[PDB]
């Protein structure tokens, strides 16, 4: 009887709390490291004028998209990942998924414009001029586009009541629309930008691997390839799971509901883990950012 008791103690009590601890610790750790890290990126560029480059201005914009997701959307995701219900009412059911989707769009477009800049600077020079004022113009353009293209996402979000509990999920009048929408969503936010980026960085790799500038360029190119690779890894589970669910009608079966919950939770958590990842990447793969981060830890 002793083995059976230890098995139910594990299933009914020890495993669920171990799960809750790991889930909350992981989300809190990501929240702190992403909030501290991304503010320090913004500070590193503001305090050091030599760091005020086109790439670094776009990296500040990537950190602000990261702060938008970490401040507003990360707590909301954590509680849905815990309760599997919506506790912020009808209004925030439209607002919060919209802001998180907008932040992904900004992140993707910011990276695209970085790749583009490096590709024209290194692979095809003298064709297009790239200045800091023009980087701000592109930065504003990225926000206007991300804010507009994510309105359809806000539109389908509905807070449904059916102890009575609300759920925040997409509402679809027909079976065809979610399939077309989530196919476009995935291609535009993930597959086409990263595919184009991987090909651009590979050309930059071929060109880079005037001597002093070529040494500087290789350091930044190595770092940005890591930022893109880490972004592609962090976003792959959520992108695939969304396509499998919305385009291939998977995970509708309730045989192992918790297995699906755990897969979607880890996938939601990884998106936020990305905001904590970037300042850590700039710390190890950038000596200039590291100096500012070391200065911040020594001062505070
Ligand atoms: C980066 C490269 C891309 C470059 C392209 C750049 C293009 C930039 C141009 C214009 C952007 C302007 C924003 C348009 C705003 C979107 C307008 C909008 O809100 O759509 C509603 C209808 O659609 C809906 O719900 C359901 C949406 C239907 C989607 C079906 C698929 C059509 C294909 C479309 C796929 C796009 C996916 C974009 C992914 C990022 C109508 O709302 P309504 O007023 O009634 O009040 C809300 C009420 O419906 C709440 O229930
Ligand atoms: C929406 C947001 C848009 C805004 C984002 C802006 C992004 C701006 C960034 C960088 C500038 C891009 C520079 C790209 C440089 C292109 C580099 C290049 O020439 O490499 C070719 C790869 O082509 C290829 O296969 C093509 C790759 C196909 C494989 C599919 C990968 C993912 C999809 C890829 C996306 C398609 C987008 C198309 C939009 C018009 C070599 O050819 P290959 O002789 O080996 O061929 C035969 C063999 O591959 C057949 O299997
Ligand atoms: C709990 C939770 N449910 C779904 C989630 O993401 C699902 C979505 C998405 C698809 C592909 C890549 C993404 F990066 C995000 C649809 C977007 C959203 O942004 N949805 C959204 C965001 C926050 C939120 F609280 C509720 N829904 C998340 C990230 N968290
Ligand atoms: C933070 C969210 C808390 C984690 C919840 C996931 C753990 C479920 S484990 C286990 O699943 C069995 C299904 O048969 C039930 O009988 C038990 O009661 C339960 O303990
Ligand atoms: C190519 C033209 C693109 C326009 C596509 C519009 C199709 C409407 S889908 C419809 O939108 C509603 C918004 O109120 C949701 O509530 C529904 O549940 C959803 O199914
Ligand atoms: C032909 S029926 C058609 O089957 C498709 C499967 O691809 C779906 O896209 C649609 O919902 C449905 O109308
Ligand atoms: C504009 C691009 C959008 C095209 C994608 C719509 C076609 C749906 S694929 C189809 O969907 C079913 C879901 O029920 C699955 O059963 C099938 O296995 C799968 O093959």
UniProtKB/Swiss-Prot annotation:
Annotated segments matching region Required for response to orexin-A: 2-15
Keyword Glycoprotein applies: yes
Question: Where would one find the signal peptide in this protein?
Answer: none
Instruction: List the GO cellular component terms.
Output: plasma membrane; synapse
Keyword Disulfide bond on this protein? yes
Q: Which UniProt keywords apply?
A: Cell membrane, Disulfide bond, G-protein coupled receptor, Glycoprotein, Membrane, Receptor, Transducer, Transmembrane, Transmembrane helix
- The residues annotated as site (Important for responses to orexin) are 10
Per the UniProt topology annotation, the Cytoplasmic ranges are: 42-56, 115-134
Family as reported in the entry's similarity comment: Belongs to the G-protein coupled receptor 1 family.
**Protein's job:** Moderately selective excitatory receptor for orexin-A and, with a lower affinity, for orexin-B neuropeptide. Triggers an increase in cytoplasmic Ca(2+) levels in response to orexin-A binding.
Q: Anything else of interest in the record?
A: The antagonists suvorexant and SB-674042 bind at the cognate neuropeptide binding site that is situated between the transmembrane helices and accessible from the extracellular side of the membrane.
Show the domain comment.
The N-terminal region is required for orexin signaling.
Q: What is this protein called?
A: Orexin/Hypocretin receptor type 1
Shown portion of the whole protein? 28 to 376 of 425
